[PDB]
Amino acid sequence: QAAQSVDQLIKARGKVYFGVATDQNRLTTGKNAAIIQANFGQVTPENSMKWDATEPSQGNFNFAGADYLVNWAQQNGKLIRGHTLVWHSQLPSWVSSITDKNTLTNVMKNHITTLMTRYKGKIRAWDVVNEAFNEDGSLRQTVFLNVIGEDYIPIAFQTARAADPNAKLYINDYNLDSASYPKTQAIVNRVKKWRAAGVPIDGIGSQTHLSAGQGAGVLQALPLLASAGTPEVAITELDVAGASPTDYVNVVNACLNVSSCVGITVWGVADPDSWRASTTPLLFDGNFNPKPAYNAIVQNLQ
Numbered sequence: 001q002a003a004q005s006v007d008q009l010i011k012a013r014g015k016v017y018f019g020v021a022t023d024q025n026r027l028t029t030g031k032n033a034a035i036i037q038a039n040f041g042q043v044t045p046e047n048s049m050k051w052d053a054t055e056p057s058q059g060n061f062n063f064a065g066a067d068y069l070v071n072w073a074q075q076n077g078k079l080i081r082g083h084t085l086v087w088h089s090q091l092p093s094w095v096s097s098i099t100d101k102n103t104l105t106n107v108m109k110n111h112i113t114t115l116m117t118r119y120k121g122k123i124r125a126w127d128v129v130n131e132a133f134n135e136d137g138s139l140r141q142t143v144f145l146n147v148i149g150e151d152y153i154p155i156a157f158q159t160a161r162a163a164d165p166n167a168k169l170y171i172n173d174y175n176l177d178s179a180s181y182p183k184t185q186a187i188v189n190r191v192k193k194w195r196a197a198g199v200p201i202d203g204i205g206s207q208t209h210l211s212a213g214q215g216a217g218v219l220q221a222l223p224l225l226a227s228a229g230t231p232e233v234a235i236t237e238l239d240v241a242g243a244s245p246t247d248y249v250n251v252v253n254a255c256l257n258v259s260s261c262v263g264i265t266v267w268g269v270a271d272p273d274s275w276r277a278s279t280t281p282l283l284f285d286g287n288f289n290p291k292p293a294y295n296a297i298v299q300n301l302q
Contacts, residue, residue: 001034002290002298006283007041009301010263013256016124017042017079017263021237024048024068031288032269033072042079042124044236044265045069049082052090055111063118070119081236081265082119084127084172085112086156088142096143104147109159116163125168127205127236128160129153133173137186154199161200168232172205179220191228204228205236208251209267209276215240215247222254222261235264239274239281245296248283252297 007018019042026032026046036043047053048065055061073080086108088096098104116126132153134140144152153171160169171191176184187204195201204225208218218235226233235255240247255261270288271280283294 001031001038002294004298004302005039006294006297006301007039009298011041013301015255015261015263019043019079019081019263019265020269021046021265021267022069022269024065024072026269026273027068027072030270032273035269035284035288036078037076040078042081042263042265043069043073044081044083046268047090049115050084050090051087051095051111052092054115056092058094058107059110061114066115066119070122074122079124080119080122082115082123082126082167084130085115085160086128086144086152087130088140088144089131091143098143099147101147101149104143105155108144108148108152108156112156112159113163116160116167120164121166123164123167125170125203125232125234126160126164127170127172128156130172131174132171133183133187135175135183137182153194154197157194157199157201168202169200170203170205170232170234170236171201172207172236174207174209174237176204176206176225177208177210177214177221178217179224181221184221184224188224188228191230195229201230203230203232203234205234207237208235208239209237210240210247210251212240212242212244212247215244215250218251218254219257222258226258226260231260232262233258233260234262237267238264239267239276240293241276241279241281243271243281243283243291243293245293248293249296249300252300
């Protein structure tokens with residue numbers, strides 16, 4: 001636990017939260033729970049709310065991990081971002097083998113409604129659709145696009161809104177970190193149009209999985225995302241190869257500069273536990289001590 005809390009300090013700058021990805025595995029080992037209690041104000045389940053975890057066979061839900069996370073969060077006064085309802089990765093084969101439009105539509109709606117209803121009123125935001133875009137800005141060829149069609153995104157969001165109107169409904173994606181990159185421009189254009197059509201998209205989530213030196217571009221990319229006119233944007237899965245203070249401070253400043261940016265979530269607590277551990281991309285080291293980037297964020301926020 002670092003003495004200064006980045007969540008406390010970001011709240012002092014008028015933001016909603018600074019949070020982290022976690023789950024039962026991390027909360028019940030090492031110093032993760034204590035660090036989150038002290039320094040962070042929000043959690044995203046790193047895995048326990050994904051489709052593989054929650055609906056491994058159709059209509060046979062497994063909420064044990066997700067319930068653990070939600071209960072721990074509520075007990076410790078942490079906000080929750082649900083993650084993620086419709087996505088082509090970590091998707092059971094029973095879903096991806098469906099070829100019938102009505103079958104998949106009903107499956108998708110049931111999956112959304114079941115998860116969101118279980119936690120109704122407890123969740124600040126849901127990543128309803130994850131990774132819907134190709135790098136060129138076209139829509140990714142997934143089972144949902146192929147079998148349901150263009151309408152899968154409208155349907156997913158309309159269904160989500162119906163299940164829990166309190167939750168902020170996000171579309172989430174990576175490589176939205178440069179203002180000149182086709183993907184960033186595309187998601188803005190499509191979100192503007194979807195919203196005008198009546199699709200209830202409340203937020204754009206920018207994952208912000210960076211390599212070294214990519215932080216600087218976020219200063220221009222995040223305002224570009226915010227120009228879509230969603231109520232919120234957020235940095236949802238921040239990590240940075242090498243964890244340079246320069247990259248981390250740039251991403252924090254981008255959020256500070258964007259009125260609709262509600263907060264930042266970093267994708268894990270300690271380096272060894274990162275999905276990209278060998279790149280030591282997080283804010284705490286393998287001794288569970290704050291790294292230079294953590295201190296730099298603190299100092300910037302003060």
